[PDB]
Paper text:
Effectors belonging to the SidE-family are involved in noncanonical serine phosphoribosyl ubiquitination of host substrate proteins contributing to the formation of a Legionella-containing vacuole that is crucial in the onset of Legionnaires’ disease. In addition deconjugation of PR-ubiquitination from the host cells proteins by deubiquitinases for phosphoribosyl ubiquitination (Dups) has been identified to control PR-ubiquitination levels. These Dups (DupA and DupB, also named LaiE and LaiF) consist of a single PDE-like domain and perform their action by directly cleaving the phosphomonoester linkage, restoring the native host protein and concomitantly releasing phosphoribosyl ubiquitin (UbPR).
To covalently trap the two members of the Legionella Dup family, we prepared a set of probes that carry a reactive group substituting the phosphodiester group that in a bonafide substrate links the serine substrate protein to PR-Ub. Gratifyingly, the vinyl sulfonate probe 5 quickly reacted and reached full conversion even after shorter incubation times of only 15 min. In order to pinpoint the exact site of covalent modification, we performed mutational analysis, where we mutated His67 or His189 and unexpectedly observed a retained reactivity of both mutants to probe 5. Although Cys196 is not part of the catalytic triad and is placed slightly outside of the active site, we wondered whether this cysteine might react with probe 5, as the vinyl sulfonate warhead is a Michael acceptor that could also react with cysteine. Indeed, despite some minor residual labeling activity, reacting probe 5 with the Cys196Ala mutant significantly reduced the formation of the DupA–probe complex. The most likely reason for this movement is found at the binding site, where the reactive warhead has inserted itself toward active site His67, but is caught and bound by Cys196 before fully reaching the target. This creates some steric repulsion because of the local strain in the sulfonate probe when ubiquitin would try and nest itself in the actual binding site, so instead, it now binds loop, albeit with some flexibility. The found density nevertheless further confirms our MS-MS data and mutational analyses and shows that the vinylsulfonate probe binds Cys196 of DupA.
Residue numbers in the entry:
A (entry chain B): 1 to 76
B (entry chain A): -1 to 310
The structure:
Amino acid sequence: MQIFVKTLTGKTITLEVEPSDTIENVKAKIQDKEGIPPDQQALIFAGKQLEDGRTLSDYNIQKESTLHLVLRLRGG
Amino acid sequence: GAMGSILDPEVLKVAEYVYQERLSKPYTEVGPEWEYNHKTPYATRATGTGHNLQRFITIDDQRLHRPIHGLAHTMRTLFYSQLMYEAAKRQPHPHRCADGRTIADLSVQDLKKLNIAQLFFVAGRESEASYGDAYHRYHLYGAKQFEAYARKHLTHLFSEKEIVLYSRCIEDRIGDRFDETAEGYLIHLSHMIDLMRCKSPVEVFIGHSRGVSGIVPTLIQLFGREDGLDIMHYARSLFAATGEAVPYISSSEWPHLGIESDRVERALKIVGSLEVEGQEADAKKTAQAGFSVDGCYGALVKIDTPDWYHQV
Ligand SMILES: *CCS(=O)(=O)OC[C@H]1O[C@H](OCc2cn(*)nn2)[C@H](O)[C@@H]1O
């Protein structure tokens, strides 16, 4: 299926995959497209930061859901 | 519109002190000894997350320290309180704080003293640490810094009573409500508005909980939809003026953020439809606004206000 991942400014990347994936999984996927390490990635859903371990099924992420992505710039 | 210079020379001098002494300084509660994980709570000096977030950013080879809670953030809040002061005068039934007072009961002199207190609001911070202990410690620090400056240099301006009240405003003591005093309310509202630059559509428009209304809904309950949206827009234009990333807005997307249609419909009925494009951060303006009071001030004074800001 297709979901959207967006920075706060609206930069959008469209992803393919499945409820079966974990969020760590989806972060690895974002990595392979745009090259951002997962440790720098905070995914948001329902205005709450997601934990790596759980699946998309748990936060009820479905068809054409929007997740938000902020980049933790550690102080660099 | 076009706000122009609202801060008299005394306020700017205080901004200059707070920048020299506090906001220009590196965060100090940082590095390995301030990392945190829930699973090892007492492994370090930190008792929560965030100490090593966003300590500084590099622009034209220059470290801008504490970019999220630096000069621009602070100066922005002074402009917000000015705008909402006028907004409050347009309301027939302004919000009554726990002290029985409203924003419209503040004088212009009060506003000046409030603005000076706003300069110290986040000045005590030693990191981006978010959790309660850090927040409360850092606000107490900012309160104490305010007091030390005010008691030496502002006693011609603030009474001892007023030093105490503004200190308490900055301290944000546990048990004190968001609307404990009119002064406090206005300070907190101003801080709240600025969070739009770095929160998701959910916190800004919908509410991070069934209890809490949401930033823009809050502006709308206080000021009406028209003035509330104008305030919102004004704040986004201050983000862009100081080189900060401006988030997009898309009310059509709100049902797709995993919130109960209940609350989505609620926000829709309050806010109505909004489609506005975001904008990338601009490093040059970020530097301009972060490294000097004049740089930041000159960028803010230029920006257009709603027309009602200027009306009698
Ligand atoms: C606008 C939010 S702030 O500047 O007040 O930051 C406080 C907040 O920041 C952290 O979250 C940001 C984030 C999301 N994903 N990755 N980083 C903490 O939640 C902290 O309370």
